[PDB]
Design an enzyme around this catalytic site. Structure first.
Site, PDB file in Angstrom:
ATOM      1  N   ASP A  46      42.097  25.519  37.056  1.00 64.76           N
ATOM      2  CA  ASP A  46      41.700  26.701  36.304  1.00 64.76           C
ATOM      3  C   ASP A  46      42.895  27.280  35.557  1.00 64.76           C
ATOM      4  O   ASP A  46      43.968  26.669  35.521  1.00 64.76           O
ATOM      5  CB  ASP A  46      41.091  27.741  37.246  1.00 64.76           C
TER       6      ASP A  46
HETATM    7  P1  8Q1 Z   1      40.785  30.929  32.393  1.00 67.53           P
HETATM    8  O1  8Q1 Z   1      39.507  30.249  32.824  1.00 67.53           O
HETATM    9  O2  8Q1 Z   1      40.836  31.049  30.891  1.00 67.53           O
HETATM   10  O3  8Q1 Z   1      40.828  32.403  33.048  1.00 67.53           O
HETATM   11  C1  8Q1 Z   1      40.220  32.654  34.315  1.00 67.53           C
HETATM   12  C2  8Q1 Z   1      39.158  33.743  34.197  1.00 67.53           C
HETATM   13  C3  8Q1 Z   1      38.206  33.425  33.054  1.00 67.53           C
HETATM   14  C4  8Q1 Z   1      38.380  33.820  35.499  1.00 67.53           C
HETATM   15  C5  8Q1 Z   1      39.846  35.086  33.943  1.00 67.53           C
HETATM   16  O4  8Q1 Z   1      40.935  34.890  33.032  1.00 67.53           O
HETATM   17  C6  8Q1 Z   1      38.902  36.118  33.382  1.00 67.53           C
HETATM   18  O5  8Q1 Z   1      38.935  36.400  32.194  1.00 67.53           O
HETATM   19  N1  8Q1 Z   1      38.051  36.701  34.226  1.00 67.53           N
HETATM   20  C7  8Q1 Z   1      37.553  38.046  33.994  1.00 67.53           C
HETATM   21  C8  8Q1 Z   1      37.533  38.887  35.267  1.00 67.53           C
HETATM   22  C9  8Q1 Z   1      38.935  39.078  35.802  1.00 67.53           C
HETATM   23  O6  8Q1 Z   1      39.340  38.407  36.735  1.00 67.53           O
HETATM   24  N2  8Q1 Z   1      39.688  40.003  35.217  1.00 67.53           N
HETATM   25  C10 8Q1 Z   1      41.075  40.177  35.604  1.00 67.53           C
HETATM   26  C11 8Q1 Z   1      41.221  41.115  36.796  1.00 67.53           C
HETATM   27  S1  8Q1 Z   1      42.922  41.256  37.227  1.00 67.53           S
HETATM   28  C12 8Q1 Z   1      43.054  41.705  38.827  1.00 67.53           C
HETATM   29  O7  8Q1 Z   1      42.203  41.352  39.628  1.00 67.53           O
HETATM   30  C13 8Q1 Z   1      44.226  42.544  39.279  1.00 67.53           C
HETATM   31  C14 8Q1 Z   1      44.782  42.029  40.601  1.00 67.53           C
HETATM   32  C15 8Q1 Z   1      46.214  42.511  40.814  1.00 67.53           C
HETATM   33  C16 8Q1 Z   1      46.543  42.593  42.300  1.00 67.53           C
HETATM   34  C17 8Q1 Z   1      48.046  42.609  42.557  1.00 67.53           C
HETATM   35  C18 8Q1 Z   1      48.328  42.561  44.056  1.00 67.53           C
HETATM   36  C19 8Q1 Z   1      49.789  42.237  44.345  1.00 67.53           C
HETATM   37  C20 8Q1 Z   1      50.667  43.484  44.345  1.00 67.53           C
HETATM   38  C21 8Q1 Z   1      52.036  43.169  44.937  1.00 67.53           C
HETATM   39  C22 8Q1 Z   1      52.782  44.437  45.339  1.00 67.53           C
HETATM   40  C23 8Q1 Z   1      54.114  44.107  45.980  1.00 67.53           C
END
Ligand code: 8Q1
Ligand code: 8Q1
Lengths: 75, 364, 76, 77, 316, 69
Positions: free
Chosen positions: F32
């Site tokens: 992916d």
């Molecule tokens: P590719 O197939 O082109 O991309 C994969 C997909 C399509 C699934 C993805 O890019 C996408 O567009 N999906 C849309 C839904 C999505 O997942 N949006 C992004 C959400 S981002 C997120 O979940 C934030 C998570 C961050 C958590 C951080 C935790 C760690 C912190 C550390 C502190 C020390």
């Protein structure tokens, strides 16, 4: 019962051997020390064992008997 | 970088989370600078900071912010709870109930109350580490004031039926305190679903800073305590609140991971070292704290002193419970630490089972 | 609401997380970011996606501050 | 606005805080610099210079406090 | 906590403490902060604040100065004078100018590390644009006659640049008494943070991040307040190291002209051995945080290794 | 070439026998976007060379990664 340990620490910090370890002796007058060496002395007494001495009680420590009667008077 | 096995330090299992320290930086800066460089807003910034921390701690345990009091740790919280309720209710409530496997500070406070004139009964624990609910429910007297049972045991890692204990205590108009120091942020706690009246919280157990804790004191109905025979610094309080918020958002993920790594450690140790037993009921065990006893290791496993008084209460023999190991697994524990720990444990147990401690024992 | 910027945020968070001077924080950071983006994969609510992106940006700021300051205290 | 006992208390505070440095070079440099500083500025009579030295000593005490505590929060063994 | 023999500089806690609030606010700029840092850098070198420009380090300062003056005079002044023992960045910039059509002369240094003032004063051409001479030799630990070079250049109406990266905060610098027109300053040389530097551009008739600029200014201020104490301390420790080595090895000599030594950099040459992993010479460094234990440990390990390597080579 | 295919095989969980020089990442290797970013970062980790986002976007086949400098 713990005066020997105090006299040992005073002997270690001030650079005096175990023969001039006289009880009731002034730090500045009988041991050739000054205010700075006295502050470091009180800090050494509170540094060997985990016990704290306030500034008011530390300022009163100008003789040996003051240090012997202040670590026992605050147990 | 050299690893460290998962049994050396109990503080090593809960390091300071970088998000917490990041929350604490501005208050540390404005704190440890003598009160002549502080700005004319330090007072407001500190009242607001402590209110946010109250809302975070309260929101984690399902309480109201007005019910959170900040202390120097779970020890002061324990003394405030037991000595506060007992000394405040010296009129018509002179009896207290606790368990024999509680922390040393709680047992010490109950012994202090016993020395000042309070009748305290120490409930025994079963071989599973869980108290007998019939023994607790049959031990409540008309003059019983407080029942203190910890949520998680810091040595064996077993969970007490906190909700049921609260139901029993509230059914007989008895105050319920719990030492949740090893439980807050790791297993779900609701001070309303569980009839909890007082709760103890430790900062550094939940990846927060050292020297800060909290205590939950119920206000509806109002529980009262007597002052003990002072103000915790603001950056530490901020740290406790931040640790509680992060814990609230990370509890499920951390529990899943810690369960996986715990099962890996136990399975890998039992797979290579037979005659190993796990102390505590597995069906009521929190995975972060593991406690294993090894069979044929005579003498002591050095890594003169007293054995374990918690393992003696779950009916474990002196020699078996003497040499025991408490493994800790936390939010930042890696798989390499687990595998290195099981390897070092196998090596040390294998070595010590073919030796006898009489040689090192006679060194005078 | 940004397709390429989410991948750029993932790359940035991994790259900054790899600069942690401590082993537990670095491993936890990479693991939590990987598992976090993998878990929030296939989310359709644009409000939830925007929320997750905002949390990811704040956490990226936290990782930056802690990596840089920790590196300024990290005596080697 | 300072006295002798307050200066000795400042010396004690700066030595105590400097001894809590998690690093060897910073701890040794701090203790050495404070000792040499008070010994060197000993027997000063001009009150303006004394007040200046005391103020700088308080500022440096704040620096030592912040750096010792924050560094201690970052000092991974 | 073990020790490390004496062969950047450590971050002074006053500097890190000065830049912490700006580091906090930088992830997730200040004109006042950058103005204060400008005033600090200027106050250390005896300049006006308006004459200080912040760069990413002494490398960018060198390129801005040398390439700026050289490229500005690409019409009728294609000649530049510098030393062959300059830093790698200065030599690289002069080689780039040589690739662009500039005639560059790399003046040699004598066995003392000091440049020949008669050779420099006789090397000026009618089409010479810039003279770039380092303030101190970072290898031998000798001081260049910066004031005399500045007098010669100002008497001949030629601009004078100097790389003071290893000299700022270690020896006194007054940008007017030495008749300096351009100067380069590196932050992590004076116990400041990495990734920040400065350049002095004379203005009188004879996007670097903010926490880094604040750090450079703080390092300059601490250096200004500590130059005398650090000079006495480092001088004592240097004499201790050199004297303790001479007491046990009656055949080691110290490279560089005495009476023109800055104490931080020692350079000792050994007779029948070389390449000491922990003729050629070895450069010991002593700084603000160097302890007596590091000096004695370095002298002990140095004596041991020299004695062993001399006892493993068949000679007499 | 051994380091590129070795790293791809190590991160994507493939042994040294299924190391095909011509397999699509999303259709023939079960990957992916996240595995792709981590893969490119692993390539930047093996050898001390950095790859910009624009050149990384063009890496959709195996041969693009095999010797690009
Ligand atoms: P590719 O197939 O082109 O991309 C994969 C997909 C399509 C699934 C993805 O890019 C996408 O567009 N999906 C849309 C839904 C999505 O997942 N949006 C992004 C959400 S981002 C997120 O979940 C934030 C998570 C961050 C958590 C951080 C935790 C760690 C912190 C550390 C502190 C020390
Ligand atoms: P004692 O002799 O019984 O009494 C003390 C004396 C009398 C010597 C002293 O109190 C006194 O009154 N002497 C007169 C001169 C005087 O009062 N001077 C004030 C001393 S203040 C001072 O000079 C401290 C300087 C600041 C030190 C900063 C160190 C910075 C370290 C930074 C580490 C990163």
């Amino acid at each position: 019962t713990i005066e020997e340990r105090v006299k040992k620490i005073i002997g270690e910090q001030l650079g005096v051997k175990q023969e001039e370890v006289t009880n009731n002796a002034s730090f500045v007058e009988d041991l050739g020390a000054d205010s700075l060496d006295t502050v470091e002395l009180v800090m050494a007494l509170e540094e060997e064992f985990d016990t704290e001495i306030p500034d008011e009680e530390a300022e009163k420590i100008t003789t040996v008997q003051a240090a012997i009667d202040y670590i026992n008077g605050h147990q | 970088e050299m690893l460290r096995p998962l049994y050396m330090d109990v503080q090593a299992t809960t390091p300071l989370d970088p998000r917490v320290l990041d929350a604490m930086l501005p208050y540390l800066i404005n704190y440890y600078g003598n009160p002549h460089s502080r700005t004319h807003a330090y007072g407001w910034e500190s009242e607001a900071a402590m209110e946010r921390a109250r809302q975070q701690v309260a929101s984690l345990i399902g309480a109201d912010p007005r019910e959170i009091i900040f202390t120097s740790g779970a020890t002061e919280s324990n003394n405030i709870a037991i000595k506060g309720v007992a000394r405040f209710y010296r009129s018509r409530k002179k009896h207290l109930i606790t368990t024999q496997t509680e922390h040393k500070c709680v047992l010490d406070s109950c012994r202090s109350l016993e020395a000042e004139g309070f009748q305290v009964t120490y409930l025994p624990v079963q071989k599973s580490g869980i108290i007998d609910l019939k023994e607790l429910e049959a031990a409540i007297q008309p003059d019983t004031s407080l029942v203190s049972v910890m949520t998680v045991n810091n040595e064996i890692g077993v969970k007490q039926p906190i909700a049921e204990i609260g139901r029993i205590c509230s059914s007989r108009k008895v105050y319920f305190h719990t030492d949740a120091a090893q439980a807050v942020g790791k297993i779900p706690l609701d001070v309303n679903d569980m009839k909890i009246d007082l709760m103890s919280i430790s900062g550094h157990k939940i990846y927060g800073p050292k020297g800060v804790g909290a205590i939950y004191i119920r206000r509806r109905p109002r529980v009262r305590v007597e002052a003990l025979q002072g103000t915790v610094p603001t950056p530490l309080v901020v740290g406790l609140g931040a640790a509680c918020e992060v814990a609230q958002q990370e509890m499920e993920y951390d529990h899943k991971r810690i369960s996986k790594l715990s099962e890996r450690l136990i399975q890998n140790i039992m797979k290579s070292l037979p005659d190993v037993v796990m102390n505590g009921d597995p069906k009521h065990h929190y995975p972060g704290c593991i406690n294993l006893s090894f069979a044929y290791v005579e003498g002591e496993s050095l890594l003169s002193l007293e054995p374990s008084y918690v393992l003696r209460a779950i009916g474990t023999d002196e020699d078996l419970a003497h040499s025991s190991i408490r493994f800790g697994i936390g939010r930042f524990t890696t798989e390499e630490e687990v595998d290195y720990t099981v390897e070092k444990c196998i090596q040390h147990v294998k070595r010590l089972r073919e030796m006898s401690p009489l040689w090192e024992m006679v060194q005078d | 609401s940004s397709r390429a910027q989410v991948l750029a945020l993932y790359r940035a968070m991994l790259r900054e997380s790899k600069r942690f001077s401590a082993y537990n924080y670095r491993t936890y950071a990479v693991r939590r970011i990987r598992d976090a983006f993998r878990e929030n994969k296939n989310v359709k609510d644009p409000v939830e996606i925007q929320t997750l992106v905002n949390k990811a940006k704040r956490d990226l700021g936290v990782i930056r501050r802690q990596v840089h300051i920790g590196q300024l205290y990290s005596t080697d």
